Design a protein around this ligand. Sequence first.
Ligand SMILES: Cc1cc2nc3c(=O)[nH]c(=O)nc-3n(C[C@H](O)[C@H](O)[C@H](O)COP(=O)(O)OP(=O)(O)OC[C@H]3O[C@@H](n4cnc5c(N)ncnc54)[C@H](O)[C@@H]3O)c2cc1C
Ligand SMILES: Cc1cc2nc3c(=O)[nH]c(=O)nc-3n(C[C@H](O)[C@H](O)[C@H](O)COP(=O)(O)OP(=O)(O)OC[C@H]3O[C@@H](n4cnc5c(N)ncnc54)[C@H](O)[C@@H]3O)c2cc1C
Ligand SMILES: COc1ccc2c(c1)c(O)c1c3c(ncn32)CC[C@@H]1NCC[N+](C)(C)O
Ligand SMILES: COc1ccc2c(c1)c(O)c1c3c(ncn32)CC[C@@H]1NCC[N+](C)(C)O
Ligand SMILES: [Zn+2]
Ligand SMILES: [Zn+2]
Lengths: 228, 228
Amino acid sequence: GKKVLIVYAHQEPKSFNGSLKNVAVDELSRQGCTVTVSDLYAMNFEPRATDKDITGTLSNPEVFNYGVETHEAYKQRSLASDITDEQKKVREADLVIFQFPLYWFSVPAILKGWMDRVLCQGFAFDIPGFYDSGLLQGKLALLSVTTGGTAEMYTKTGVNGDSRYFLWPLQHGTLHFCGFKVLAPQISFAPEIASEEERKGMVAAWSQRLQTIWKEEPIPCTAHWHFG
Amino acid sequence: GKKVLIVYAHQEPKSFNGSLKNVAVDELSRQGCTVTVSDLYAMNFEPRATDKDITGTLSNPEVFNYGVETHEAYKQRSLASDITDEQKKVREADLVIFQFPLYWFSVPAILKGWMDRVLCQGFAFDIPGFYDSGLLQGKLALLSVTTGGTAEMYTKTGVNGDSRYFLWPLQHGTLHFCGFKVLAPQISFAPEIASEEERKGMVAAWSQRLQTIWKEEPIPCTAHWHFG
Ligand SMILES: Cc1cc2nc3c(=O)[nH]c(=O)nc-3n(C[C@H](O)[C@H](O)[C@H](O)COP(=O)(O)OP(=O)(O)OC[C@H]3O[C@@H](n4cnc5c(N)ncnc54)[C@H](O)[C@@H]3O)c2cc1C
Ligand SMILES: Cc1cc2nc3c(=O)[nH]c(=O)nc-3n(C[C@H](O)[C@H](O)[C@H](O)COP(=O)(O)OP(=O)(O)OC[C@H]3O[C@@H](n4cnc5c(N)ncnc54)[C@H](O)[C@@H]3O)c2cc1C
Ligand SMILES: COc1ccc2c(c1)c(O)c1c3c(ncn32)CC[C@@H]1NCC[N+](C)(C)O
Ligand SMILES: COc1ccc2c(c1)c(O)c1c3c(ncn32)CC[C@@H]1NCC[N+](C)(C)O
Ligand SMILES: [Zn+2]
Ligand SMILES: [Zn+2]
């Protein structure tokens, strides 16, 4: 029995991202997995890190420090409920898939806000208790990303550099920092310019990969893997 | 007579970030520069890329494609006023300074949202205006970032990798892509653990740097600069 959370960041259900999300739901559901989707846009998920995220007395009301106050709020159980709702989904999951279009070599801001607000100290990491000792150890994560740029554009000698370069802040700085083991990314390059057959092939490749996802091992999430 | 825009992303005016922003305002104002600050949290700036960003008739009401719709809205002058207000500030500026704390090896979500929503096709880049030919060519950009981690953690073989590694999506994937020439980043490492005198040294380094900012040459914003 496995539990999967899909954190999904696209505005349009008929989009290529939406199709990739649905085939993940369909395939993991068919396998008998428990599946939950956080559809951030449909949830109107709040991306801003503000003092509204702490619902009780601040430890220092004179000078607001988001990190200090959210860590204390986590321990006291005074974080906003939208944050703890996401934390419950993550805590229960064996695998967290992030499904998103690449925006500025990174995640859409709504998804960046989920990272900023959900992965607070005490929940996702502690100091000490990060990278291999992070608090989400034992869990897997996987980035399923779509791009405008082609695969050739995302090579070492291409104008955008290798695709693994833009994965570093997400895979290493975020997921590995929190103790996740990271499965190899699923990058669906340039669906907007792919042919109809090429798009269907990309959707089928993801569905096929998910059939055997539980047999995969994580990547070595190191500088060498990303930069060689 | 130079014009500067500071895009500032911190919740607390008394923070180290707030102080770096105020030193920049004071010093650039003293030089006789024209200075504008976009204080994103005070503006409650919207980070989400949604259909509310277009005020006109959608080019395709059946299927929402954020990039297509914003490109068309830019051309038809029907973007939301919060976006067009920011575009005016950028259009007028000779230098754009981004002042932020590092969140998950990147910008806080509110600032990511400014990038996502302000830098639309037609305004910041197009086919074929990108990288050196980007539409904001002629302008300078500078990242002034504060970190939790120490300089030693941000080395090639340190736990976090070189700081240049996390700069790639921001400096290259975003600023260079839009045609900015990128001035060397200002990285203020670990002010929360630094001594009083170290903090003062880091602020003064920034104030002093700002005295000669117009004499600087841009970095070569290449994969080699970042990873080599
Ligand atoms: C703010 C912003 C920043 C960006 N920054 C970057 C960047 O830094 N680097 C980069 O490379 N790109 C960037 N892009 C481009 C972006 O990554 C792509 O536009 C996006 O990944 C395309 O995915 P989509 O789901 O929106 O595609 P869609 O336009 O929804 O899909 C493309 C086509 O596939 C079709 N389709 C949907 N489902 C199926 C299916 N099941 N089978 C067959 N076809 C199907 C759709 O109908 C459509 O015709 C950026 C875009 C924006 C808006
Ligand atoms: C969601 C989140 C994600 C994060 N991700 C990362 C990450 O990926 N990598 C990483 O390294 N860090 C990360 N951090 C830590 C973050 O980058 C630092 O906490 C932030 O950079 C500290 O800057 P600050 O302005 O908030 O410091 P502050 O705590 O406001 O300032 C530090 C000290 O300097 C003092 N000070 C202010 N002005 C002056 C002045 N004029 N002269 C002397 N002292 C002054 C303050 O009073 C304070 O005592 C993260 C934090 C959060 C909340
Ligand atoms: C670093 O490479 C980028 C950076 C920003 C980008 C893009 C690519 C990119 O391909 C697109 C984009 C947008 N805003 C920022 N970016 C909108 C859409 C876009 N790609 C789709 C357009 N086209 C011509 C494929 O249909
Ligand atoms: C990739 O390195 C990280 C990633 C996330 C981090 C931090 C460092 C970091 O130093 C902090 C942090 C927070 N949320 C995510 N992160 C809150 C505060 C924090 N700052 C460290 C110093 N200390 C112990 C004063 O909080
Ligand atoms: Zn790693
Ligand atoms: Zn570059």
